[PDB]
Symmetry: D3
Subunit: 152 residues, 6 copies
């Protein structure tokens, strides 16, 4: 899908509490990606168990689920060329200690457990996460007036 690739991103409860939602959104807007879905939600533990199913045998899994369910999150879908991989570069390493300055985690976070944002790790993960969090009628198609200036 090339420039139509999509990723799932979510601002975690700490990002909402720390008033960093606009800052995060602005970084993806300024990069050139197209916002195609957005909502403030409180995720159920049932949903979050499915979301993090790959991690279910890790010792932190339970508290990760409980935490992500504990307050509002901002769920998003962004669209563009290589948006999955590039979003992960913008976000930075899982452990903010390893995330360089200039990344979101590098600039704003200290600890792995309070690392502001989730982004899909692969196109296949993105497909699964988008379907989990969003209905199809929440995913918008619009003609981007900037696209001529971002793409060949």
């Amino acid at each position: 899908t090339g420039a139509h690739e999509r990723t799932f991103l979510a601002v975690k409860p700490d990002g909402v509490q720390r008033r960093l939602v606009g800052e995060i959104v602005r970084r993806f807007e300024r990069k050139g990606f197209k916002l195609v879905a957005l909502k403030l939600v409180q995720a159920s533990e049932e949903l979050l168990r499915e979301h993090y199913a790959e991690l279910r045998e890790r010792p932190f899994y339970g508290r990760l689920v409980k935490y992500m369910a504990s307050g509002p999150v901002v769920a998003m879908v962004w669209q563009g060329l290589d948006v999955v991989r590039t979003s992960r570069a913008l976000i930075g390493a899982t452990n903010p200690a390893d995330a360089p300055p200039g990344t979101i985690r590098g600039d704003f976070c200290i600890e792995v457990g309070k690392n502001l944002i989730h982004g899909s790790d692969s196109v296949e993960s993105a497909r699964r996460e988008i379907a989990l969090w969003f209905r199809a009628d929440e995913l918008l198609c619009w003609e981007d007036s900037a696209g001529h200036w971002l793409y060949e």
Copy 2:
């Protein structure tokens, strides 16, 4: 309400020009830095139907058809913000309807030029806010959460 006033809510929407011009984050950050509490948020493609109801007071103005068509022309970011005097204060942060009359420091004063592409809507009154919130959101979309910042914004 009247208890303390702090649970007043307004409807704000980033119009299609705000999305196209990549100002969503900038607009949200201004309300975040002010101290208001985001209690609802969604990106939507608004139907002409809903918009006719939203702008019903402008039903017999000459621009009405172009406004509705335009607001339906692309995504809108619909929001509800909560806090003391949020309706009046949000109108001040946005600035005058005609950007030419909105001072620098306001959203319209800083970011736009013409009345027909003026980035954002905010409820003009508490009663308008009640009506607009109900029109645009379901009850279950309005979130109750515990704002760690409140202690530092409110006496």
Copy 3:
């Protein structure tokens, strides 16, 4: 008049909300010279004196208690008309009346949590500077930018 000085303090809410740097940057960008700075926990006794003119007001006790409740950033800034200009940058006491573009207009909601204190007059500034700082904390420096800020 370029050596006029004012006393500004970031109140405990400004520290807690991580707005210290934002506030300092606004006075830097305006052209004023920072000549004193410290993070302190003010005593209630100091604060009772600082706000003595308000001692008969219903809110005086809670103002004092609050200002003593957490760290504040005490500052002295220097430049032409700095006292009045700083008050303009800060905005009205009640943030509801502070326009966008001002510190209180951009960042605050309520009169009791209004981020920052600034002296209200040159004589108030002299008094407040003396209350909060020793003479050896007030620095003198030659501003490389001054030729570009003053005629």
Copy 4:
């Protein structure tokens, strides 16, 4: 009226204080179209004509000599009501009178060091644009954002 143009110039103090980008960004973020730009040093002869309406004012000589003393960034911006709106963005002549949120309100202290010039009227802009720029320095370009700025 969307093709109205104004002449703006970053004065020597704006260049020296490293505020050129900040100023340009304010006009870009507003939605105006940059149609001419150059870093130049103007002659006193050009400046005497630029400010010819102020020839009887006691500061005229000083103003001319100062504006000739260092580089300035000359610009033309295009858009609806650009002259009047640009003046609003810049703020009052005397920065003491310019509210926070304006360029002069945010960055300046004194009337002689007030960062930027903007034309005062459509007819003054026509005159100033002609004075500072060759016709071939004003560029026509198709504005991708035009549909989202204008109805």
Copy 5:
């Protein structure tokens, strides 16, 4: 080496996306000295010469046509190691390879729409500056901040 100079150009996509001021501010905040600036539309003849090292590359033709298609902001910046450092601030040619914090890493997606050109070497810079600018367009000014940037 503090008098080294580089040629930078904001490409048509940077103008259209309203990123001129953002880009300039990044070089200003670094401490580099702006010594020439203009908004221009370059000829294919000039651009063929500009990019002559790339003449056997498959994209050469489309690169030349594109850079000729709309306005660019041509600039010269001065300072110690300005060529190499500017390239670092810009980031990798392909924005997919440019880290966050760089211009291309922060603002761009694709190699053909990568916002800005910067000279690749001191000798390339000398050639490019000569190609785009007349000698009288390069300004000598006394930098008020130089004592605080350099030893």
Copy 6:
């Protein structure tokens, strides 16, 4: 420490060039936004004496006299910041000693050019931080306060 590590402290100082160039607020804002806790702060005119001891280790370097003279050539903003891995992290945020080697996104990478005017000092190690904090601050200048934000920065 070793309980959780969250009470580690570093000494940071904005050098005179950072004061003159009006980057104090910019610098402080980068540490605030990262989540570290400001526990001490003062503007000082550092004596040639204090500085000779600060930079004792560099006594045999040919630039030593010029470093001490420069660090006394205007005000310095002395700070103590607290948090998990604050010494190592602060060094990463500042970037390499030589700004030409500091990547964009770091303080030195974004804001300065030459090694002799490199804006800021941060402790290079936990032991150095212990020594620097002791040298520049009195114990009663290091404040214990309840950080509302810690709940959102720490698990």
